Amino acid sequence: APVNALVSHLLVVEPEKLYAMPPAVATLCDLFDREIVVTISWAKSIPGFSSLSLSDQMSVLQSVWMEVLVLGVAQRSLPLQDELAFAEDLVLDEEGARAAGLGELGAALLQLVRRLQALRLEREEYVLLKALALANSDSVHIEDAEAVEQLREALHEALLEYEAGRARRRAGRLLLTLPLLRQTAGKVLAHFYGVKLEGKVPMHKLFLEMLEAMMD
């Protein structure tokens, strides 16, 4: 039985499985919109996030929501080979992402998946990395930079304490995958901002607003 309070809380507030059911790009747009809603309540549950000013909470979420969603797609895809689990009931391979109308995203996402697979990411490490991505936002709009940093440091410390007990140290290997996570998120955002401009796929207001926000 572990002992890290932050890790336990993060495990507890993890959202439940996502199902695309029970048109390609349209389904993904709807799914992502629902994922954003889940990400917002999830963030509010993080000890340290809700103590941030309301404006900073928005600034952080507008800049990192896609990284959180992308890490979620990667985590769900870990047990698969050359496949992407956008939802439990919605899996696609590189060639599948093609037809669906995702372009190169299939390949970008898989690079991330393979990077995490190489590490053999454990549940504890995943929730910590996800929270870490949220707290590592570099949005110029954040006003209380120190408070965000305090949150990041608390999560960083929890990761070190966790590794120090279970699982070129381990913590650093996990942290070295964050640049790719952000770059991958940037590609997914660009693509969907494109889907928005082409005006052929229906998209919900929240998703549209967040796409415009993380685009600034």
Partner: peptide, 14 residues
């Protein structure tokens, strides 16, 4: 930067 929907979900203590 519009933030209406985000604000709504963030401030809906639900």
């Amino acid at each position: 930067r519009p933030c209406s929907e985000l604000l709504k979900y963030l401030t809906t203590n639900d």
